[PDB]
Design a protein around this ligand. Structure first.
Ligand code: B12
Ligand code: B12
Ligand code: B12
Ligand code: B12
Ligand SMILES: C[C@H]1O[C@@H](n2cnc3c(N)ncnc32)[C@H](O)[C@@H]1O
Ligand SMILES: C[C@H]1O[C@@H](n2cnc3c(N)ncnc32)[C@H](O)[C@@H]1O
Ligand SMILES: C[C@H]1O[C@@H](n2cnc3c(N)ncnc32)[C@H](O)[C@@H]1O
Ligand SMILES: C[C@H]1O[C@@H](n2cnc3c(N)ncnc32)[C@H](O)[C@@H]1O
Ligand SMILES: [Br-]
Lengths: 197, 194, 193, 198
């Protein structure tokens, strides 16, 4: 399997319910592209394609579920293999109503890969509870991944302003203007998140 | 005890400590044992503590996310045996997924190819996937009762030749209404087709 | 069972089997755990079997090379954070490198930028590199005692602002003689930094 | 190209992340065989020459070599390990340069040969014993220095396995003849030579 065919091979393995094969193809990608690379060049393209294929009516929700659940597990495995250093944590989650979690996981991963103690909470955290936990742990930052725009639209002006000393918002659902309205620092690239920290 | 220590380590955001305590549990009780003696009690306690107002949603999220990751690791350790799969998910509207994962685990430990889909699968899409993979069975975990009451009579009938429904949200009457076989305990799930 | 399975798989040249067993161990014990409970015991057993005359050097080589590769894979998966590095190597004349790799791994897993150099680094060259990179520490793994004895009193004193020595070849007395801080456990190395 | 200089520069600044990104870029551009030919091999040679000229110290070479060995080992595992009678790959007694042997194992694996890399510096009787016990079809040796070959007696490599191949900058046709090994210049033609009779 040539690298440029790994994406289709992996999706095909998943759609035949061949998890073992899917795992082997993912690992080949990991060995070729490296950890950050396999996420960029294999995990993300497959997931986007899964979304487009669902939208065109080529696959159903259950096939997306299968693929997403599998890729989340692969990313979680990489996350546990990265360091978890000591010191004030960075809490990573998604806004209330946002159930797409892989962006948040990616953010947490890229941070840990740079030696930042990113605590991934899971998705969909109410803001008062998030604020309270950041406070109690002395969190240096809160990072939010927004895939959809609607959950940000549902929040009032300034809603993200006091969650932690620094509050970062990114993802396809977020933009500079909405981040300003909400009182968060906008971040375009995962790479520049650790730098900013 | 390990249960309190693990919860305490999670609530301090000490993941390394939490991981070490979980591994100790795993090494002592073994795979099935650590679920029964450590993973399940901590999750229940997290629920009760939230309900009493002792912890907030972010603490529950942290603990649940951690334990889901540990259970997924056990799922991959159990292995994924070959042959026609058994699809495992939760009803539409059901976001609690650890019960489904548990079902998949117990099945895999008995050599059943339990394919965990993730939670919250619309029934037509589930039916379609069972059909395309030639699935022998479908297993649903219901933690809440409400998602089952929202479903039409007979809605679980014929998703596969065998359809099983269990969890704290499910009962015999609702399973009959929906056209599923009710199952009380995970232990008797692999027996039902074995 | 995994230790015996893994050694048996290696001695039959079944690398695929060996890889699967190691991953099983990794999933069960976790990363630090699989090194402690699987990599280390297998390598000790390899050494004892060689010492008894039961296996030749080629079998040990096969097993060692395999386990080094597994550890290197884990090392690359750990973070490499920014900032002043910690250089990790072995004393001149020390060709057993897996202890050093372990030290680098445990450090990286705790967010320390441990640069593993490989084994067997002359002290002047090591000192020079620590200086030029502004390294906060040097860590040395000694498996044999002989490369340390050879060394003069206070040979390790100024390699970097902090210098740590550990491994089965090292002890408190020899560390004091050499001007290094002795460390018994890998766990307490990141703490000390 | 100049990925080579960039990579060496990143290594000498202790920027492993940068070094890894440059290597990956090379791997994505040239492909697996290509990145070895265009990036891994040139950097290693240059490291050697820079040490010899007094421009870098031993610690810098160690850092770079350790890094590139790790990258090559990753490619080895990516080439895969096929079933069937193995080919044992190592270096002669006294030979501690191992990357040539790893390269040989890689090129063999990329052609579907189960090349078992032992690591370097294997005593000949022990190697012969292991080849025999595993039913190895061949042994492959990489010699970087000439001295370890010079130390061996006539015919020493002859019967290590049914076929014995010797290559590397330390080896030549006459020394291979003296030692009873088949000489091989280029790694690409190694699988071909092995599938063919002697
Ligand atoms: C799997 C999936 C789901 C899963 C999520 C599973 C889970 N537990 O995570 C489930 C089943 C829950 C789901 C449900 C739905 N989702 Co959906 N699905 C996806 C899918 C296929 C993959 C999502 C993913 O992980 N992709 C990877 C994402 C994270 O990559 P990315 O956004 O490009 O992220 C990049 C950057 O943004 C950056 N980044 C991300 N976060 C952050 C944060 C920071 C700080 C920084 C610096 C960078 C950064 O990192 C990435 C690098 O490229 C996408 C398809 C797609 N194109 O994304 C949709 C998609 C996002 N979903 C969509 C829809 C419509 C839905 C539903 C409304 C469908 C429905 N009718 O029920 C629901 C809504 C649920 C909700 N959130 O409330 C649409 C969104 C269209 C839109 N924007 O309007 C998509 C695009 C599919 C489509 N083509 O229609 N979904
Ligand atoms: C974590 C958690 C969540 C998480 C889920 C995260 C995830 N999975 O991705 C999140 C944050 C999403 C969540 C949200 C909510 N949940 Co909640 N939470 C939990 C908690 C603490 C653990 C859930 C869990 O892992 N299940 C534990 C399972 C393993 O429970 P169990 O009883 O031990 O299950 C046994 C058997 O049922 C059997 N089994 C399970 N499934 C099956 C299937 C088969 C076939 C068989 C044979 C056996 C079997 O296996 C287990 C053996 O011990 C529980 C507390 C609890 N006691 O369950 C609630 C709990 C279930 N949640 C509850 C509530 C109220 C909610 C919310 C409505 C809160 C809100 N207002 O937003 C939402 C609703 C979401 C939804 N639509 O589903 C309540 C339910 C009360 C009720 N009405 O019955 C609980 C009980 C908390 C409480 N103490 O009040 N929750
Ligand atoms: C593989 C191996 C080799 C390989 C090394 C391959 C490589 N790394 O590239 C090679 C082939 C080179 C080799 C050669 C030789 N070695 Co050898 N071999 C081993 C073996 C089997 C495993 C070594 C290993 O990696 N073990 C795993 C390590 C990680 O375990 P560990 O050292 O106990 O480390 C633990 C602690 O010390 C701690 N730690 C380690 N470093 C540090 C550093 C710090 C700062 C801290 C805090 C902690 C710490 O962490 C680890 C976990 O608890 C051991 C057997 C054994 N029992 O060790 C010998 C062994 C060490 N070798 C030995 C011998 C005899 C030799 C040779 C002299 C044989 C010969 N050629 O004649 C040569 C000498 C080479 C030299 N100059 O160093 C003996 C030494 C006994 C002694 N001291 O008297 C051993 C014990 C074998 C035996 N039973 O006889 N060897
Ligand atoms: C890193 C390195 C080391 C490392 C080895 C690390 C390891 N692998 O574990 C260490 C630090 C151990 C080392 C030490 C020493 N080495 Co040194 N170093 C190197 C270096 C840079 C290795 C580069 C390499 O991996 N070569 C492999 C590739 C890059 O080069 P290559 O051999 O041309 O490979 C091609 C072909 O030969 C072919 N090939 C190789 N093997 C095989 C096998 C077959 C079957 C086939 C078909 C083809 C084939 O493939 C390649 C392209 O097609 C070389 C520099 C160099 N130019 O090679 C020296 C070099 C070989 N070392 C040298 C020296 C001097 C030493 C020491 C004697 C120094 C010392 N006094 O301590 C010791 C001796 C060690 C020993 N063998 O006992 C000199 C040799 C000069 C000479 N005598 O001819 C070199 C050439 C550097 C130099 N010019 O100063 N070294
Ligand atoms: C964005 C992703 O959301 C999933 N999706 C779409 N509709 C639903 C639903 N009602 N319930 C669950 N998941 C759904 C699809 O699989 C799509 O690919
Ligand atoms: C059953 C679990 O659901 C979580 N929970 C309760 N309310 C919400 C909400 N609005 N959003 C997300 N999770 C919530 C709690 O943390 C509880 O422990
Ligand atoms: C400590 C390890 O050193 C290895 N060992 C012992 N003698 C030699 C030799 N001549 N060459 C290479 N390795 C050797 C053995 O395989 C032992 O297991
Ligand atoms: C061929 C390579 O050998 C390394 N080299 C040279 N002398 C020594 C030594 N005493 N110990 C270890 N490595 C050494 C150099 O770094 C050179 O680049
Ligand atoms: Br390696």
């Amino acid at each position: 399997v040539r690298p440029e065919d790994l994406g289709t091979g992996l999706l095909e393995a998943l759609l035949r319910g061949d998890l073992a094969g899917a795992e082997a193809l993912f690992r080949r990608g990991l060995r070729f592209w490296g950890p950050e690379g396999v996420l960029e060049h294999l995990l993300l393209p497959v997931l986007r394609e899964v979304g487009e294929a669902w939208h065109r009516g080529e696959i159903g929700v259950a096939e997306e579920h299968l693929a997403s659940t599998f890729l989340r597990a692969r990313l979680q495995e990489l996350l546990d293999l990265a360091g978890f250093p000591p010191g004030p944590p960075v809490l990573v989650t998604t806004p209330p109503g946002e159930r797409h979690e892989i962006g948040a996981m990616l953010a947490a991963y890229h941070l840990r890969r740079k030696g930042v103690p990113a605590l991934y909470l899971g998705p969909d955290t109410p803001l008062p509870d998030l604020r309270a936990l950041a406070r109690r742990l002395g969190a240096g930052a809160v990072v939010l991944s927004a895939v959809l725009s609607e959950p940000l639209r549902a929040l009032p002006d300034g809603a993200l302003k006091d969650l932690a000393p620094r509050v970062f918002l990114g993802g396809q659902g977020a933009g500079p203007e909405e981040a300003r309205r909400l009182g968060a620092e906008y971040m375009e690239d995962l790479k520049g998140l650790a730098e900013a920290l």
